[PDB]
Design a protein around this ligand. Sequence first.
Ligand SMILES: *[C@@H]1O[C@H](CO)[C@@H](O)[C@H](O)[C@H]1NC(C)=O
Ligand SMILES: [Ca+2]
Ligand SMILES: [Ca+2]
Ligand SMILES: [Ca+2]
Lengths: 705, 743
Amino acid sequence: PDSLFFTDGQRRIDFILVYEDESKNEKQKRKRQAYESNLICHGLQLEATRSVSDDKLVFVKVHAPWEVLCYYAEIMHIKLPAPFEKSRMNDFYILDRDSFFNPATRSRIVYFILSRVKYGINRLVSSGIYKAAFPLHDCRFNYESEDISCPSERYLLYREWAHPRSIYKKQPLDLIRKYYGEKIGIYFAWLGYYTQMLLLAAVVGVACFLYGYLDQDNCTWSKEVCDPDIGGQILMCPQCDRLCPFWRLNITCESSKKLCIFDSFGTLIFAVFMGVWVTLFLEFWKRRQAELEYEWDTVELQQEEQARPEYASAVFFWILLIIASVIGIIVYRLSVFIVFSTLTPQMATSITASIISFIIIMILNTIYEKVAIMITNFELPRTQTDYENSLTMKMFLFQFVNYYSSCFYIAFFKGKFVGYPGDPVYLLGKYRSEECDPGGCLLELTTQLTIIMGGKAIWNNIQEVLLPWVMNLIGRYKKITPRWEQDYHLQPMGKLGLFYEYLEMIIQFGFVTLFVASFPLAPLLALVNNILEIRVDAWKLTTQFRRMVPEKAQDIGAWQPIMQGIAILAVVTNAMIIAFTSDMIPRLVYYWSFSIPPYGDHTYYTMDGYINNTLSVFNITDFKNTDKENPYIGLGNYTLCRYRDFRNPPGHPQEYKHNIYYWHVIAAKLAFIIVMEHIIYSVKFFISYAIPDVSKITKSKIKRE
Amino acid sequence: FEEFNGKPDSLFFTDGQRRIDFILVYEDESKKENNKKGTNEKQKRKRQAYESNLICHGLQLEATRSVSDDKLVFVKVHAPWEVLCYYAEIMHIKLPLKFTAPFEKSRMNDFYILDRDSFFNPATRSRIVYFILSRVKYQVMNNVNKFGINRLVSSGIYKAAFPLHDCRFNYESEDISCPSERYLLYREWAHPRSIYKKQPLDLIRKYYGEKIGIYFAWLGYYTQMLLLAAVVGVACFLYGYLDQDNCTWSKEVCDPDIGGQILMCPQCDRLCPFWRLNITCESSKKLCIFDSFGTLIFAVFMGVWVTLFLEFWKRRQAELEYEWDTVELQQEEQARPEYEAQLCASAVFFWILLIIASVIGIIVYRLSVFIVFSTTLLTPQMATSITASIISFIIIMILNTIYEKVAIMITNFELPRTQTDYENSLTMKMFLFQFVNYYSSCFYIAFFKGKFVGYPGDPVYLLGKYRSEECDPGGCLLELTTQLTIIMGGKAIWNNIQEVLLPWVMNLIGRYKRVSGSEKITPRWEQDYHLQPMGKLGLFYEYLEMIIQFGFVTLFVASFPLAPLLALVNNILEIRVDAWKLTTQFRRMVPEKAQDIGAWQPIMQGIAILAVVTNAMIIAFTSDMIPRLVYYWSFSIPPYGDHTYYTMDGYINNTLSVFNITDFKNTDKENPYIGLGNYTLCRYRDFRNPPGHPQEYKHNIYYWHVIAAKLAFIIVMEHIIYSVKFFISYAIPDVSKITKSKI
Ligand SMILES: *[C@@H]1O[C@H](CO)[C@@H](O)[C@H](O)[C@H]1NC(C)=O
Ligand SMILES: [Ca+2]
Ligand SMILES: [Ca+2]
Ligand SMILES: [Ca+2]
């Protein structure tokens, strides 16, 4: 029959208690008998039926008297499924007296009852007193419930919103909350809204990328780099000790042509726009949260305190943060070194280096999870909410360092403080500092970013869910037991599933927002990943996991401080990326200052001769001040080689010292940082302050009273 | 009604059992009516109607004729038992218990009730009576209800309406039962003889209500924090003062063999000759005093101090709201639209006017300097700077009143929904106007003086014949300090003088307008009617002046370490100045309640945020510390210098640029220099390449080195300061432990 009510009875179930008989020592059987007797004496129904599939396992089912449900609903501030009170029974309109109450709310009430009972229930399950304890789903998602009376909410919800065939359809948040709970509803609403404006972000990013694409022909510096008469004649200095000869500059046409796309004014405009996009996202999210708070039953007060089975060292945690950053940096460096120590070839080398780094990061993720779990366990938090808050902070910090250490190293600490060939810098001793090509390391940063984002999202989602679905696709293209048994055969989501999904989404948000200057197409990947992830989460939650008790919440949780922190960090990170990682500022300075007779020779501002007039000159006879073993010995009759640094030429009164152009460029970079930082923060403050005159609709809705 | 019995200080009715609450004053028809008689009879009819509704609502009233002027009639008021209790219930007035509840007639026995008249203090009784008089209606026309005591005075129906003081401030009440709180307040709080005693905020709150007690508590806390800042700033200034023989650059300037031999280059076009650098020895010494590392340390400490001040003010505010058990009435909030009343164009117009206000500020400073300098032909330069600052300050004070009037006009043109909206709009507009008016000259000196003037060969003219002004080799920091100190001192002095005098002189005119030889005893109400009305705005101007003072203290503390000391002295005087003026020369304000100071708190937070950037900019650009450090660390060394080790020797000569007189291009005024014909080259304050050279007069590597150092300093200092402020704000729990325990 697979009925939802009591067998041959008119009564609705809200939990199943399952145990293993001690008869295959009697201590466990006696303890369970005492616990069950206490539970029965407290005033709850019970019934035990043997499972046909397994004789050892015997399941126990419960019920819910109407009087107890009403009394406990009136116990705390609960509105219609305005505190409830039996003295005001007829005040609320009723369609039916025996089934009107939402089954989700009934399940939550009985969950509270079980939590308060002691012999306990949670510890009994943990220690093996009960094998499991869970509520029941409405029906099988495969087909409509046999019981015609049942609404079959699971089937309708699955077909409408969980199956991929409804990928394009809108999110039915009302059924989601009325079935699962407020936590799932708010999570999915936030995800949908996030995708909603990621659409606009992706459109703007695509516009900027296309604008960069249509300007390949006019990208003068790349053309000069390619022209053999200009690029080929320039002979660059060696970049390493033993595994590099003098190399012509024009070997980088592909690199320069690809870099000119991601190093144009379009990226600057996109970063500036994202600066205000972040604050618009925040402010509209507060508007939407207020609207949901008004429309939903989210004005119910929270318990003063809560129970937990479990009732300085902060420095030790920070030392682990430093070690995590260091180990990430060496992981990336070693990967690139080993791959290099053997059109497409160099690009493929970078791709495989990034792939290896991403793999190492993926393995390190599990170790970071485990160490965070033990370290937070050692603290013995007094309550639960603080436990989730501590997990959020510590896990977010570990993931942040583990996933952004390599990106930050590439953006800032690669080629920034390498001395001239005469006196190279060995920071740690016998460990030379890496230096980028004349264009810069922005393209490498973009490659690392895209590889990490793709790999993470794709591998995670695919490997975790798509297996049965891909099997079904392959098949298409190329006895019965009651509900409790089937539900038991499922697996539970634990207690951190929503936490893990939020962690994924926050790492995704950090990737899309922090380093947006390097990769303007990141929001498009964000949009695709979220469009898939929403349905992936819905399908997995409604198919492969046991039903979870609903909970009450008004905000996403502890992640909003991380949102604001990420925004304030992203503005400065983008400013520094544009200033230092990109070479836009030096070329603008050259255009406006070093193409005029005092320094240049052209009759008007132009980009001509930027490559020739910017590269420095080095003399081999001054190979080192120490006059020790050298790589420049022999290797042809070359006399002068050029390097990517702003320094005076040989023979100058200030030999191999930073020249006027260096300081002009540094001043321009710092001025850009200051102006962009100040303007962006001023605009963000103004936009936030413009709430009353822009989004007054929901505030008026609240003021309806 | 009935006439005066004869007891002057009696605050009761003639019977002696009913406590007066308000005095209503109206002009009787006994006057020789002129103009329109219909207006007079309508006025009378409205008066009887209002009195009829007031008595119907349950207020006992009686009148009396003034002893001297038969044309004035005073109408008393009283709040009987049931109405008092009922309205206390309606407004949720909290009363002493002995978990917490307002006062309701259902729970009379649950409160510490000793006597009806004693259970409700006179301030609360007057507040209740004011609410009754405001809510009560008198007459209706055109299907619209018209009500409010304010409307009657606005239309001239009533001359005034006010509570009464306990007794004369300087004399004890003749009534033995009278507490005479005014006497104690005058002896202990006002009357500066108690210049040092900690003011009793509890009695102030009891007498004048929360609205005044909160302001005075804020002022006291401000004064204490100012004491801390003043001590630290004095320490920094003293450290700068005691280290003078080590200020090498000023010694070089004063040395006749270095500063004397440097023939500087004329600043103006032709009205000033060449000059030698040694004539600024005194200015160099003063700058050594006011431009040391102590100034930087104090700027950092003040960046910390503003945050500590704000956080501890939040803690004190929490403690005070709990202590004065104002939570219930704070929650009880109702808004009534203004009874006087019955598009971004106005906003943009106001913004334009603000821009012009700044423009006149700059022009006034520049013109004062111009005239003082033109009149030419302790130190004459110091005297000239002081004079220019004096005229600029005078014009600023003149413009202050005009700006107030225009702000009132602008806010009146708009129709604020209620009194609170009007107050907030006026606060914002007045603050912007005063900010611009007072700080325009200071910002000009700091940032736009001697900053974008080219080399002497090609001077920069803004639009023709308006040559940009330039500073001396030391800089304009001393000029900015002089302007700031003059403005601050003059503002404080004039405000205190006007505050002390104007009510007093107006009261004296009021008294002398009664030359009739009374020389007798008069009742409380008649003599209290002669006091000034203390117009509806209230403490708005006091808060405004204190906020402008806060702006002066914080924004420009990188140039004047002694500003907190001036502020401390001013506030130490202002406590008693305000107390005396409120207790001696004004009618009793109607008590009311407020959560905090009000709309000024956002202003203070914004000023605190802006102070960091303003101070960083001042130290980076207005001062010359950054060039000094750059020379010490990177140009006294053999790559560019000749000294073996880092030193500041030779900074003056190696930094000053060179210019050849004959290289003056342009055919206009071909005799700027050749008239004197003394030498062939001059020195000027700018970093440019010397004559000859591939880039003859273009900015050199030193210029860009210095600019990069300045920008890096700005970035580093601002980021560090803001992060530190965020960390302090996070660490502070925002509430005291004891208050958290009680709540
Ligand atoms: C670069 O320039 C050299 C010298 O002109 C040349 O022969 C080569 O074909 C050019 N292109 C590449 C990819 O090396
Ligand atoms: Ca997932
Ligand atoms: Ca004053
Ligand atoms: Ca005052």
